[PDB]
Structure formats: C-alpha cells, structure tokens
Amino acid sequence: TLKASGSTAQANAMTRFVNVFEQACPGQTLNYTANGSGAGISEFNGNQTDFGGSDVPLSKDEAAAAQRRCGSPAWNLPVVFGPIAVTYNLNSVSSLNLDGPTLAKIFNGSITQWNNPAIQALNRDFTLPGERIHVVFRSDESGTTDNFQRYLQAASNGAWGKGAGKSFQGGVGEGARGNDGTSAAAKNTPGSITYNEWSFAQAQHLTMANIVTSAGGDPVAITIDSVGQTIAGATISGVGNDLVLDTDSFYRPKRPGSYPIVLATYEIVCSKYPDSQVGTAVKAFLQSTIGAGQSGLGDNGYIPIPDEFKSRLSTAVNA
C-alpha cells in the first residue's frame, strides 16, 4: 500500500488511478492526500511519502533536495493533463466570454464589477448586472495557481503586473483550501470568480468562462480544443527519463479554437529508491496509471500518443 500526497488538480483522476490500480494489482492500494503541489514536493523531499503529485516540476534547489532524499536523481513524470477552468457564479448567465487582459485585471483587482466595460465589450449578446465581482483564490501552496498565473503573465499583454509561483499574487478576494475549497465556495458565493481544474468545475456544476484567445478564437473547454493546445507542448525539456514538459506555447496559440489554460500533473519519483520494495510498488502503479488508468474522457485529458513511448520507457526504468 503506497503513500503519496500533493496537487488537488489530480485528485478526481487519482481516485480512478487507485481503483484501477487496486484492480490491476489485487491486494495493493495507494493512499493519496490531496494537499497542494507545495505540500507534495516538501513531503516527498522530507522522506514522508513514496511519490509526490505536483503540477510544477522540481526547481533545481528542490531537485537536489530530492536527490539527497532519494540517494538518486528524482524524475518529473507527467500522467494527466488538467484544463484550468475559469468558473463563475452569475444567476441566469451561462454564456460568459473573458480574455487574458480582462481576466488579469479581475484577478489583480483592477476590475471590481461585472458590467465593467472591458467585460461588457466581450459580451455583446447580453447585458451584465451592476454587481460586484468576488474573486476566490487558493490559500495554500498550489500548482493550479502557478500555472494559471503563468497563463495570465503570457496572455494578458502586461495587465497582470504580478508574479507567478505557488502563491496567489492578486491581492484580491478570499482564499479557500485546495481545488475543492475554491470550487465549493464559488458555487456558494454569488458573484464569484475563481480558477479550477476541469474535474472540480464539473462535479460542482459551475458555469465556465469561454476564453477569447490570441488566435481569434472563442473556445469552451472540450476534448478537441484542449488537445489542439496540448499538441504543441514539448516532452523536451528533460534530459532524461525526467520528462519535464514545455508548455509555453499553450497560452498564446495561433491556431484558433484552441483552449489556452492547461496544466500537466507530475508524479515526482526517485530514479532509484533506496528501498527495493518501494521502487517496485511505485512502478506498478505508474505502469497502471499510464496504462488502463488513462480513460478520462470526462474530467481530465489523457496523455497523447507522441509522449507515451517516452513515458512508458521512463516508468519502466524506475528503480
């Protein structure tokens, strides 16, 4: 029975990954604590867990930390993609469009009302209400937050004016803990605006914003337009069975009807675990996770094929 913790973005998927795993390997299971990428790398580096789930790969300072943790180099192994929804709560509004620049101004607090003309210019077919916007952010160390702020940096033509990384840089709104804390609260706070992985926005039945793009597109999240994006992501950088991905192309696409806000969730593991028994259970799960465990179709986005012979080969090399 493995132990693991980390990103909440991969929490609904992991329920399927573990179930598939407990079927694949009868008598074996996995314990996942969904607590944020921040808590995922720290607990892995502290020799608390067997692998860690994180939407950001290790920085060079954490990579060394994991090397001492491991006695061997640590690998960033991506197993699922998470589209990042911009969820909102406006009664009778099922049709919202938002672009990078006005989505930056909302989350950095420059825009405080829903019928603000930047919001209204993008929404020509209906009148916005004169009511206040309630931004909801993540209060803990978060990979959804890192990726989402990087999208805002890339796609907002400077309107964001803030940094990225695992803590929210907006200076607006209120926090909640984990992807479940913000989806639940947004649903519960009228006027609310937040950012969630696709699975959380669905199971709470939150309206999701259509994102106006650099390409002259106006896409909803769907299978075809997330993949479209995912297509230009490179399984380079890493050297490597360390499949660190480059997704910088995601946030300013040129091919329309591509949906620009997408993260990948990594399992962070030891190339060689000090212990034989650990490195064997971690590889099984990950053989399964990338194998039968990759249906999705609903809440997440399965790993595409050009990446898979690289990934099957790196999971086959664990310990």
Side-chain angles (χ1 to χ4, degrees):
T1 69
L2 289 163
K3 195 161 142 41
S5 71
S7 89
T8 66
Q10 72 164 355
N12 284 329
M14 202 52 71
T15 308
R16 298 172 59 83
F17 290 149
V18 156
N19 187 73
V20 170
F21 179 50
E22 293 176 350
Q23 237 180 313
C25 289
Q28 294 187 273
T29 170
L30 188 139
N31 180 35
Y32 188 80
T33 303
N35 60 347
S37 301
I41 303 198
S42 75
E43 293 181 320
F44 176 70
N45 284 4
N47 192 20
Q48 293 168 221
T49 55
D50 298 299
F51 66 79
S54 177
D55 316 324
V56 184
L58 305 171
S59 63
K60 314 168 211 168
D61 296 301
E62 305 166 9
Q67 176 143 321
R68 287 172 66 88
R69 151 71 195 86
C70 288
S72 62
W75 295 340
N76 296 296
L77 312 175
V79 303
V80 69
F81 278 83
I84 296 179
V86 173
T87 62
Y88 68 94
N89 189 342
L90 292 174
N91 272 314
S92 293
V93 166
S94 185
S95 43
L96 198 82
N97 307 312
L98 296 168
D99 53 9
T102 191
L103 244 191
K105 287 191 151 64
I106 287 169
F107 279 98
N108 79 15
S110 292
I111 290 199
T112 52
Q113 216 184 5
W114 280 110
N115 62 342
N116 183 285
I119 308 175
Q120 187 63 70
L122 286 157
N123 292 276
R124 301 155 170 116
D125 278 347
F126 61 86
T127 294
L128 287 144
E131 277 231 329
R132 157 132 199 158
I133 308 177
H134 296 292
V135 177
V136 175
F137 61 95
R138 289 277 299 284
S139 59
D140 59 319
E141 281 340 329
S142 167
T144 297
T145 299
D146 198 344
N147 295 280
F148 180 58
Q149 289 183 129
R150 291 167 151 179
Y151 154 80
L152 301 175
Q153 289 187 314
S156 75
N157 312 127
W160 177 227
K162 287 327 170 50
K166 286 176 185 76
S167 291
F168 187 59
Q169 300 302 145
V172 65
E174 225 184 290
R177 193 214 181 283
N179 263 304
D180 187 75
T182 56
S183 60
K187 184 65 178 297
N188 290 289
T189 323
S192 72
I193 194 186
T194 194
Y195 51 96
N196 298 126
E197 200 281 318
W198 205 12
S199 71
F200 295 85
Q202 278 167 339
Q204 269 291 345
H205 302 287
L206 287 163
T207 59
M208 317 182 194
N210 299 143
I211 295 296
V212 182
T213 288
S214 52
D218 182 4
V220 43
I222 73 199
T223 313
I224 294 160
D225 65 43
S226 297
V227 171
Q229 283 281 124
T230 272
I231 279 180
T235 308
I236 320 87
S237 306
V239 46
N241 290 320
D242 180 34
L243 303 169
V244 181
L245 293 189
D246 178 346
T247 68
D248 190 75
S249 56
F250 281 29
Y251 315 118
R252 294 198 69 74
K254 179 59 172 175
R255 298 175 58 180
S258 301
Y259 184 76
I261 336 181
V262 168
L263 61 78
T265 297
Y266 301 84
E267 316 303 329
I268 298 170
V269 307
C270 299
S271 50
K272 278 81 157 155
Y273 284 94
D275 179 11
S276 157
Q277 293 293 99
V278 177
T280 299
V282 173
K283 171 192 64 34
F285 177 67
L286 291 181
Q287 291 184 332
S288 178
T289 305
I290 73 150
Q294 296 273 295
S295 174
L297 271 68
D299 58 317
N300 289 272
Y302 64 90
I303 299 290
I305 296 104
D307 299 312
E308 295 170 27
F309 300 163
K310 285 171 180 172
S311 200
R312 155 209 65 85
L313 164 60
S314 62
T315 288
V317 175
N318 286 352

